[PDB]
Amino acid sequence: RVRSITLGNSTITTQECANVVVGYGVWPSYLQDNEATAEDQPTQPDVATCRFYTLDSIQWQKESDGWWWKFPEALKNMGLFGQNMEYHYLGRSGYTIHVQCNASKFHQGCLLVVCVPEAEMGCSDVEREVVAASLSSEDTAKSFSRTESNGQHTVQTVVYNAGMGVGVGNLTIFPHQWINLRTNNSATIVMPYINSVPMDNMFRHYNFTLMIIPFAKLEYTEQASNYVPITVTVAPMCAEYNGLRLA
Amino acid sequence: RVRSITLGNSTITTQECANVVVGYGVWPSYLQDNEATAEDQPTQPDVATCRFYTLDSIQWQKESDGWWWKFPEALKNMGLFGQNMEYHYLGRSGYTIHVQCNASKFHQGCLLVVCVPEAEMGCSDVEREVVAASLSSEDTAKSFSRTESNGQHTVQTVVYNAGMGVGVGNLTIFPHQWINLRTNNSATIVMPYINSVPMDNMFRHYNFTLMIIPFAKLEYTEQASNYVPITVTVAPMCAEYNGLRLA
Amino acid sequence: YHSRTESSIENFLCRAACVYIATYASAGGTPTERYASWRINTRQMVQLRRKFELFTYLRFDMEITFVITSTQDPGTQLAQDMPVLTHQIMYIPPGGPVPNSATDFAWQSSTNPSIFWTEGCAPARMSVPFISIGNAYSNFYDGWSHFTQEGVYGFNSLNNMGHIYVRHVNEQSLGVSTSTLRVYFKPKHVRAWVPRPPRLSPYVKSSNVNFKPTAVTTERKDINDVGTLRPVGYTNH
Amino acid sequence: MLTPGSNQFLTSDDFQSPSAMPQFDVTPEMKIPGEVHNLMEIAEVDSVVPVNNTKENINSMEAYRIPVTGGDQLHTQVFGFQMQPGLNSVFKRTLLGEILNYYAHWSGSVKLTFVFCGSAMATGKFLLAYSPPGASPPQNRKQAMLGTHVIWDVGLQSSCVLCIPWISQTHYRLVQQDEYTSAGYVTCWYQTGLIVPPGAPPSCTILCFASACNDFSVRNLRDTPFIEQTQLLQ
Amino acid sequence: SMEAYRIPVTGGDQLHTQVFGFQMQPGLNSVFKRTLLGEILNYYAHWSGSVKLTFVFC
């Protein structure tokens, strides 16, 4: 029934038998000798990068709308991964996203968890431009909004347009999963490295965006927990960085 | 899933697949020809002694503290076992203790069930001595206390000292089991005969003591059952008694 | 993966312990001051009691060593030259006659092994085997003496070990000669059964298991209060 | 090199000793009949038991003779006693009891023989009833019949043997024990009367013998209580 | 009291607060010196090994 996973020898996690979605059909892997536009052979840190990094839990309530995290920025302050981000210049890594809810049999709702590659976002004032502080915090979820935003340098946050200007109903085209509290309680997404160049800077490029959006609102009875906690866990897979030594 | 047991052809019991604790590693058995300090060959009553004797249910509440039964005194009035206790002089028997709770998925708590051999108990007044009426009733549970007892001939009943003068947290050293309502609902303990002589009088010697102690208090919601019933069942195993006939 | 040989029952329980210190005179006085008596038990020295009451049943042989030291007594008519002092040590098995005075008949009983010891030699030693009716000694006994469920509670008659009685063989005409006895007790070939949780409350009675309620541990400042802290320094910058 | 128990005199020690008279040749032993190898041989011998010790017969030969009267005794009791050798006043002075008194612990089974000293022309029946240690003595004949009993006919047979067994919680009884009404009882009842032809005496006698069975054990030798004086003779 | 053993987990909304914390020194720390392990270790002047912890959610 239950299964335990031990990555990095320092992290323990528990899961039940559930369907897993492997990205675009491919599995994360190291860089072969076929593709390269550089010289120094990449160093391959795996002792500490490959471990479960559990982010803070969030509260799903009746009037909540959704959240998004920008990756790889979400792991800027997360242990040795942040140190490798700071010390090196080029980088490549795939991820494994676990999302778990904790709701009884008396709650109800329906969530969509997607992984949008290159999710460029618009601005509230169509004339101005966004800034780096409004796009994403370090490791804190950025909330969507029910109504129209009116800031100057703030990302438009109407939920049904998803900030990208497209219908929210068609987001299923990307790697995704449905968490229906009636049947399911967890989701797993394995995302490889997707870009037009083999390596890129971690602080410059946002590889992708993780969005959690409820389509069916949360409902319950008076004598019940007012919220449902959502826990997100990330474990980098097949990380690479450039070389710092002379040829 | 479920299993039915029929002992003595007069008793029926139902259990689910659960772990069983076999005493100190040994299984109850008859007396061999190796060990003896008497002459007359023991008679072996098994037709009616080996049957389930269900004791009365008790109520686990929010402010309850714990209970203990003295064995073999607890089966003094229980059918043919009591008759064999009265009619004979020497005796030997092991037991099988079943403890079952009835709580829904909305209750919570944690119980410890132990079997302490030779659980000599102190007195409330350190100068006086205990009497036989305060140690144990016939087949009614004797309750522990949250605060300090002040009687003259009464056993000290502070729960965290267990009446024996030792820390209650270290009672796990004896044969024991945990009944956590979150996962478990029942416990089974098979206790052999433990003494320094092959046979002894039933009315003189208290073979052991069964203690049920809650470490995590019972909690629930307003519209729920105010208590949880606990049922204890005893079935003697391999009973022996002396012989009443001339050589 | 280092050794455990020091934690075995033999290496844990076979340490000699001083379990009795007494004194007795060699001349006129109250008769009870002219001999020393001791009933063999393990319930009077709290340090040894706490070690034996980790197990419910025990089986061992006794080794007893007696250290006897004598000195002259101040007064009048001091002895100018005394030859030597001789001491008699008698072990009384359970059920044997027990002296009620010095110079009694029980001192000359043929069923009581005795040691006659002269000053100046090595300390006297004896060894008693496992002398009991049952198959083990029991530190804890839950039950009564009679089957009427009445009598002395917690007393078992199957773990009697006898008595030890010491007196002066010599008859002294000039002066008094006080003497001091120390008893050293040691178990051998120890076997233990059914371990028990060690005691928390202090002892109050040698015969009973009575106690006062005691806190389960020592107090702490807070639940998340780790022990103390360190000041800023060269490492901590 | 010198242990604490090196230079003492323990009265129950077994060491060899120097011979006071070496170079002396002792007389060779002959074959005297009747050698004793164990005290149990002195206990497996039947000895007459003084059942009728009623303070008028202790200083007489009437102690041993159990009286059986004729006439018409409806269902009255002939005799009765308790099975506790060594401590009961009846048994403590026989061979078995006096051997047992030397030992603090003892256990085994006791054999009883009853012999009818009466005319060869006398006919009757008796009922011998035995009650277990935890019970009460029968009060009338019907209660005795419902227990463990044997009907002894003095016309067909002259002697009746009865082997009282040993069922005890421990494995060793004690002479100095306070265990009354926990030792067992043996009683004899008038199943019918004693019938004689014209010319025979109407009253008879029963003699009782008690002895040891095959299995006994004795432990912890100690001084007997029968001897009292500690004075030395002359 | 019996509340010594129960580590309290409160609901509501605790952002990132600490549930409990202690130091790993059996035999000398006030927490461990009175358990079976600490009380066995207290008899010996020298000791060493690895300590196993189990947490159960009631």
Answer whether B120 sits within 8 Å of C154, measured CB to CB: yes
| Tokens coding C75 | 């007064």
CB A177 within 8 A of CB A169: no
Angle at the Cα of A146 from the Cα atoms of A141 and A152, rounded to 5 degrees: 75
CA dist B49 and B80 (Å) reads: 7
Identify the three-state secondary structure at position C50: helix
How does DSSP classify residue C203?
P
The resolution, in angstroms to one decimal, equals: 3.4
Residue D169 forms contact with C (CB below 8 Å): no
Residue B153, both tokens = 């001939």
Which experimental approach was used here?
cryo-EM
Closest CA to C153 of C205, C213, C200: C205
Name the residue of chain B whose CA is nearest to A224's CA: B221
Q: In what order do the strands lie in the sheet with A176-180?
A: A142-143, A67-71, A208-219, A108-117, A176-180
| Neighbouring-strand partners of residue B68 | B142, B211
Q: Do C118 and C86 contact (CB within 8 A), yes or no?
A: yes
What are phi and psi for residue A169, nearest 5 degrees?
-75, -20
The residue count of chain C comes to: 237
Give me the amino acid identity at D119. Answer: S
Q: CA nearest B180: which of C141, E56, A46, E48? A: E56
Chain E residues closer than 8 Å to A59 by CB? 13
- Of A202, A203, A190, A194, the C-alpha closest to A234 is A190
- How far apart, in whole angstroms, are the C-alpha atoms of residue E2 and residue C201? 16
Q: Best residue in C50, C57, C135, C142 to probe B by mutation, most B CBs within 10 Å?
A: C142
Burial track B175-193 (b if 16+ CB lie within 10 A, e otherwise): bbbebbbeebebbbbbbbb
CA distance C18 to A139: 68
Q: Report residue C35: phi and psi, to 5°.
A: -155, 160
Would you give the DSSP letter of residue C52? H
Instruction: Output the six-digit token pair for D123.
Output: 């006919």
Amino acid at C165: Y
Q: Distance between CA D100 and CA D92 in Å, rounded?
A: 9
Written as six digits, the tokens of B196 are 């320094």
DSSP character for A159?
Answer: G
Residue with tokens 């041989």: D41
Burial degree of D146 (CB within 10 A; 0-12, 13-18, 19+) = exposed
- Tell me how many degrees the CA angle B187-C54-B65 measures, rounded to the nearest 5: 40
What string of H, E and C letters represents the secondary structure of C182-201? EEEEEEEEEEEEEECCCECC
Distance CA C72, CA C84 (A): 12
Chains contacting B (3 or more CB pairs within 8 Å): A, C, D, E
CB B238 within 8 A of CB B93: yes
What domains are there in chain B, each with its CATH number?
A: 2-241 (2.60.120.20)
Which member of C65, C114, C117 has the closest CB to residue D10? C114
Residues of chain A contacting B222 with CB distance shorter than 8 Å? 223
**Type and span of the H or E element at C165:** strand C163-168
With residue A177 as reference, give the H or E element that holds it. strand A176-180
Q: Note whether A191 and A208 are within 8 A (CB).
A: yes
Taking any CB pair shorter than 8 Å as contact, residues of chain C touching chain D are 64-66, 89, 95, 105, 109-118, 121-127, 133
H-helix or E-strand spanning residue A21: strand A21-22
**Are B170 and E35 inside 8 Å of each other by CB?**
yes
Beta strand pairing call for A186-191 and A21-22: parallel
Phi-psi label, residue D98: left if phi above 0, alpha if psi -120 to 50, beta otherwise? alpha
Q: Rounded to an integer, what distance in angstroms lies between the CA atom of residue B37 and that of residue B197?
A: 9
Q: Which of D214, A11, D56, C39 is nearest to B247 (CA)?
A: D214
**Residue C13 CA: distances (Å) to CA of C17, C55, C134, D148, D161:** 10, 11, 21, 55, 57
- The pairing of beta strand A2-7 with beta strand A11-16: antiparallel
CA distance B208 to B226: 32
The answer to whether the CB atoms of B242 and D166 lie below 8 A apart is no
Strands C137-138 and C55-70: antiparallel
Which residue type sits at B163? G
**Stated length of chain B:** 247
Does residue C183 contact residue C166 with C-beta atoms inside 8 Å? no
Cβ burial of D47 (10 Å; 0-12, 13-18, 19+) is middle
| Torsion C130-C133-C136-C141 (CA) sign | negative
B22-to-B28, B177, B190, C193 alpha-carbon distances in Å: 9, 11, 5, 17
Q: Name the residue facing B108 among E36, E56, E58 (closest C-beta).
A: E58
The tokens for D38 are 């164990």
| A99 close to A212: Cβ distance less than 8 angstroms | yes
Q: What is the 3-class SS of D58-103, one letter each residue?
A: CCCHHHCCEEECCCCCCCCEEEEEECCCCCCCCCCCCHHHHHHCCE
Q: Which residues, listed in sequence order, are joined to residue C187 by a DSSP beta bridge?
A: C62
* CA E55 vs CA A53, E6, E18: distances in Å: 21, 11, 16
Q: Do B247 and D166 touch (CB under 8 A)?
A: yes
Residues sharing a CB contact under 8 Å with residue E45, sequence separation 6 or more, in sequence order: none
The ranges assigned to domains in chain C are: 1-237
For residue B72, say if its preceding peptide bond is cis, omega within 30 degrees of 0.
yes
Structure tokens given for B233 = 């069942």
Radius of gyration, alpha carbons of chain D: 24
User: Among C36, C91, C35, which Cα is nearest to C63's?
Assistant: C91
Chain C CB contacts of D4 below 8 Å: 64-66, 122-126
Among candidates C134, C137, C210 on the partner chain, residue whose Cβ is nearest the Cβ of B123: C210
Query: How far apart, in whole angstroms, are the C-alpha atoms of residue D55 and residue D62?
Result: 11
Inter-chain touch C114–D3, beta carbons under 8 Å: no
| Rounded-to-integer distance, Cα A111 and Cα D68, Å | 108
Cβ contact E35–B109 (<8 Å): no
Q: DSSP per residue over D190-218, as a string?
A: -SS--B--BTB-S-EEEEEEEEEEEEEEE
- Write the residues followed by a gap in chain C (C–N more than 2.5 A): none
Q: What is the DSSP string of chain B?
A: -EEEEEETTTEEEEEES---EETTS-------SSS-S-SSPPB---TTTSS-EEPPPEEE-TT---EEEEETGGGSSSHHHHHHHHH-S-EEEEEEEEEEE---TT-EEEEEEEEEET-----SSSSS---HHHH--SSSPEE-BSS----SS----BGGGTTTTB-GGGGGGSSEEEEETTT--EEEEEE----SSS-B-TTTB--EEEEEEEEEEEE--SSS-S-EEEEEEE--EEEEE---S--
Q: Whole-angstrom Cα distance, residue D68 to residue D49?
A: 16
Instruction: Determine the Cα–Cα distance for residues A124 and A158; give it in Å rounded to an integer.
Output: 10
The CA radius of gyration of chain E, in Å to the nearest whole number, is 15
Distance of CA D115 to the CA centre of its chain: 16
Can you say whether the dihedral through the CA atoms of B73, B77, B80, B85 is positive or negative? positive
The whole-angstrom separation of Cα B201 and Cα B203 is: 6
Q: How far is CA B16 from CA A40, A101, B188, in A?
A: 63, 30, 11
Distance, in Å, from the CA atom of C207 to the CA atom of C204, rounded to the nearest integer, reads 9
Query: Do D and A share at least 3 CB pairs under 8 Å?
Result: no
Q: How does DSSP assign D132-201, residue by residue?
A: -TTS---SSHHHHHHSEEEEEETTT-SEEEEEE----SSS-EESS---TTSS-EEEEE-SS--B--BTB-
Task: Using the structure block, give the residue that is written with the tokens 């639940």.
Answer: C223
C15 contacts: CB under 8 Å, gap ≥ 6: C186
Interatomic CA distance for residues E27 and D165, integer angstroms: 60
Radius of gyration of chain B (CA): 19
To which residue do tokens 């795996």 refer?
A46
CB A139 within 8 A of CB A53: no
> Which distant-in-sequence residues (6+ apart) come within 8 Å of B224 by Cβ?
B104, B106, B107
Residue C11: enclosing H or E segment and its boundaries? helix C9-13
| Chain-centroid distance, C-alpha B44 | 23
Instruction: Write out the two tokens for B160.
Output: 């965290």
Strands (E), A72-124: 91-101, 108-117
Smallest Cα–Cα separation from B178: which of B118, B120, B114?
B114
Spatial distance between the Cα atoms of C100 and A56, rounded to a whole number of angstroms: 82
- Taking the Cβ of residue E7 and every Cβ of chain C, the question of whether any pair is shorter than 8 Å is answered with yes
User: What gap in Å lies between CA C177 and CA B215, rounded to an integer?
Assistant: 63
Q: How far apart are CA A8 and CA A50, in angstroms?
A: 6
φ, ψ of residue E41 in degrees (nearest 5): -65, -30
Exposure of B244 by Cβ count < 10 A (0-12 exposed, 13-18 middle, 19+ buried)?
middle
Which of C119, C187, C121, C164 lies closest to C21, judged by CA?
C164
Name the phi and psi angles at D69, rounded to 5: -90, 150
Q: Helices in chain A by DSSP H: which ranges?
A: 79-87, 132-135
Cβ-nearest to A56 among E11, E13, E16: E16
